[PDB]
Amino acid sequence: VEWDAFSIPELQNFLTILEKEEQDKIQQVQKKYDKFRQKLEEALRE
Amino acid sequence: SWTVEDLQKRLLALDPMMEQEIEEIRQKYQSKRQPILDAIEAK
């Protein structure tokens, strides 16, 4: 991708898009660990 | 009794593992935004 072909506002928008994708990805991850944790906390509390 | 310790060890492993995945994610996404930042700065 030749990013220089895009205008400043287009490039800014791509950054906003990537920022939103990165947060979503981090959310997926926090959620995955939260489910591991609940199963663990159940076994422990027993 | 081994079990409770092992379970306990896994629980205490979660956040450190999770923070390490997240770090991997941020580096990945920084890598993806870097050539965009460069194009912005080179204009």
Author numbering:
A (entry chain B): 2 to 47
B (entry chain A): 9 to 51
Sentences from the study reporting this entry:
Recent research into cellular homeostasis has shown that the Hippo signalling pathway, which is mediated by mammalian sterile 20-like kinase (MST, the human orthologue of Hippo), controls organ size in animals and regulates cell proliferation and cell death. The MST-mediated apoptosis pathway is controlled by its interaction with RASSF family proteins and the WW45 protein.
The crystal structure of the SARAH complex, consisting of the MST1 (residues 432–480) and RASSF5 (residues 366–418) SARAH domains, was determined by SAD from a single SeMet-derivatized crystal at the Se K edge. The MST1–RASSF5 SARAH heterodimer is characterized by head-to-tail interaction of the two protomers, forming an antiparallel helix dimer between the elongated α-helix of MST1 SARAH and the h2 helix of RASSF5 SARAH. While the SARAH domain of RASSF5 consists of two helices (h1, residues Glu66–Ser373; h2, residues Ile374–Glu412), that of MST1 has only one helix which corresponds to the h2 helix in the MST1 homodimer structure. Thus, the h2 helix in the MST1–RASSF5 heterodimer is three residues longer than that in the MST1 homodimer. Another difference in the MST1 structure between the heterodimer and the homodimer was that there was a significant distortion of the α-helix of the MST1 protomer in the MST1–RASSF5 heterodimer at proline residues Pro453 and Pro472. Moreover, the guanidine of Arg470 of MST1 formed a bifurcated hydrogen bond to the side-chain carbonyl of Glu388 of RASSF5. Therefore, we think that the extensive hydrophobic and polar contacts in the MST1–RASSF5 complex stabilize the heterodimer structure better than they stabilize the homodimer structures.
